[PDB]
Design an enzyme around this catalytic site. Structure first.
Site, PDB file in Angstrom:
ATOM      1  N   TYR A 113       0.762  -1.353  -0.419  1.00  0.00           N
ATOM      2  CA  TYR A 113       0.330   0.224  -0.244  1.00  0.00           C
ATOM      3  C   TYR A 113       0.568   1.134  -0.226  1.00  0.00           C
ATOM      4  O   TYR A 113       0.864   2.246   0.913  1.00  0.00           O
ATOM      5  CB  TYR A 113      -1.069  -0.337   1.062  1.00  0.00           C
ATOM      6  N   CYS A 114       1.815   1.351  -0.981  1.00  0.00           N
ATOM      7  CA  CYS A 114       2.610   2.346  -0.995  1.00  0.00           C
ATOM      8  C   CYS A 114       2.381   2.662  -2.399  1.00  0.00           C
ATOM      9  O   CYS A 114       2.269   2.000  -3.134  1.00  0.00           O
ATOM     10  CB  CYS A 114       3.771   1.586  -0.718  1.00  0.00           C
ATOM     11  N   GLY A 115       2.761   4.256  -2.917  1.00  0.00           N
ATOM     12  CA  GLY A 115       2.612   4.797  -4.182  1.00  0.00           C
ATOM     13  C   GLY A 115       4.099   3.511  -5.083  1.00  0.00           C
ATOM     14  O   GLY A 115       3.725   3.652  -6.007  1.00  0.00           O
ATOM     15  N   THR A 173       4.431   1.088  -4.342  1.00  0.00           N
ATOM     16  CA  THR A 173       3.755  -0.490  -5.414  1.00  0.00           C
ATOM     17  C   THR A 173       3.531  -0.684  -6.681  1.00  0.00           C
ATOM     18  O   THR A 173       3.922  -1.880  -6.812  1.00  0.00           O
ATOM     19  CB  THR A 173       2.400  -1.298  -4.255  1.00  0.00           C
ATOM     20  N   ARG A 204      -3.774  -4.813  -5.042  1.00  0.00           N
ATOM     21  CA  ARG A 204      -2.260  -3.344  -5.472  1.00  0.00           C
ATOM     22  C   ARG A 204      -1.712  -4.715  -5.713  1.00  0.00           C
ATOM     23  O   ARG A 204      -0.811  -4.945  -4.680  1.00  0.00           O
ATOM     24  CB  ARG A 204      -2.534  -2.378  -4.290  1.00  0.00           C
TER      25      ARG A 204
END
Lengths: 188, 188, 188, 188
Positions: free
Chosen positions: C42-44, C46, C93
């Site tokens: 859940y990181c940019g 990712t 994601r």
């Protein structure tokens, strides 16, 4: 056969005076109206110390006793060891030779797990008037409860029977506290 | 000459459904008993989602509507963008193909400065049952108020007139919530 | 009489694969160039997972092995239990059916007291290129050391002898990492 | 046609003395060995103030100048306004009439966004000897950089040409600092 309900009062607690090294039972203060204030040396509100002296002077004859409780939980504004607290007031802030004209006690917590038992009693006995408990910044203790003390120089009044009657926000001026106390004393 | 007092209800608010991209006024829910739950995907309590489905199934005929509000304020346990929340429930946790059988809305704050206005209303309308607001760890928002939501899966019941009636701790099982709701529905 | 100095390498460590439930010694990777990446869902960053797949595909024939280490220390962006991590990548994601084409391991700390021992080794072996360790917000662990990992998707290259050679900031694109690795591989 | 490289020294900076209300350029200290110490009143290390006085006394003839920089970033151990700092040292801690025998300056940040420019210079000029930057607790500033000051009473030595030479941890006794300085002074 029979259960007798035993009820809690301020006289069930005690604390160590700052200036002696001796325990003071709140039984000493039987029949008196007690104003409990949590105090600090490096708060904007520290300026009100002489107002607290004046309040105590003015209302001693009416049976008011002010009690001050140093606490380092609110912005870490009481960093001093117990021996340093009175010298700090006299020579730093307020400075100018200031000496409190009411009894200060040893420093300790008023909130969270290691809070002083008298403050559990006071806090559980009288709700705070505001829905605001804090900022993310101001709350430094654990656990956090709705009746926690919000900041330095919050105040509780205990009646002559040891039951807490009233609680003021730290945002209330000592003059308004006096005015409120004067109106309460008209009952007696 | 005359002042008419205008009173607040749940029907004064609205929110954006997760699965459409469309606003839903709570006026839709006139005459219905509304259960508001703040939800998250990565909480121990996320396991109760199928219990919420069952509650909704069971009590739909009695006029109960469950509404779920994703929120990332409690342990950062709803990290997903709005488009990721339903896939996460279906395929991650609970997983197994789980789809909520009640309406979820877009993610947002329930506490602090950017809290959703419906949650201000709910929180101000019904006190939380516990004196415990949090741990130093659990509180992540600003400002902090005594009627804040404590954690994921806290719950509010709103009556068929739009006035909030009841609030449960996140610590209360969905079974006890059901039992309480069933006893409340006996009035109608 | 004589002291023989015993020297540390990557082959001294091991970790549990995510997709088996079995320990993998890094001795398996003898003679190979190893790219260690700490990962999150859940990181940019990712979004770079498919770029990591492509890197691995492209450079497998040159003896590159990519290894991914889930970690929840950076914005709490890997909240999932070990069993939830691969489903989250496939369905949330990046989503779209994404499966990593390199080995992921069980989730654990890369910084602070409970950090994985391989990350102590890597971090102590190769300095980070930036003087910036963090924001007040980003650092979530204890103790804090100058060679700590700054964020999700930081990267280390280990040579075919098990000695770490290079470390990239999380701010470096996978394309620039590839370009750097391609220039390093020209020695062999 | 020609570029002349202009180089940075300690003489490029200045600060406001605590006891005057006047700016002091570090050019004053040309040809002198300068010991910069960040100071606080309510630290365990505050006890070393008389050791700093002794160091200054002893080594003044050798051209050493000690400079003290109050800072409130490390445990909030310098809460006092500028006017309160010297009275606090004299009457609280160390107390006993203590007056520093070296120059103190106005209070300010040594780390993070509002750090004093001389401390940027010092910190960028000389690495800290330890890999440990802090605990989760001790770091109170933003951003966080590997060459930040770790705590109260960290120390830097600047040579007689204004270029920083050496830096000590706050963990090093003033006696060991003296011993190190005495060995450095043997070059001159």
């Amino acid at each position: 056969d029979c259960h007798k309900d035993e009820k809690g009062t301020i006289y069930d607690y005690e604390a160590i005076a700052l200036n002696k090294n001796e325990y003071v039972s709140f039984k000493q203060y039987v029949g008196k109206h007690i104003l409990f204030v949590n105090v600090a040396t490096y708060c904007g509100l520290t300026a009100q110390y002489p107002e607290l002296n004046a309040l105590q002077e003015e209302l001693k004859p009416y049976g008011l006793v002010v009690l001050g409780f140093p606490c380092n939980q609110f912005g870490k504004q009481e960093p001093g060891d117990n021996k340093e607290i009175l010298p700090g007031l006299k020579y730093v802030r307020p400075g100018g030779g200031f000496v409190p004209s009411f009894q200060l006690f040893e420093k300790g917590d008023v909130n969270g797990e290691k809070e002083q038992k008298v403050f559990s009693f006071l806090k559980h006995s009288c709700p705070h008037p505001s829905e605001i408990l804090g900022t993310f910044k101001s709350i430094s203790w654990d656990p956090v409860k709705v009746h926690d003390i919000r900041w330095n120089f919050e105040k509780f009044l205990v009646g002559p029977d040891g039951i807490p009657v009233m609680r003021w926000s730290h945002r209330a001026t000592v003059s308004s506290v006096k005015t409120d106390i004067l109106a309460y004393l008209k009952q007696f």
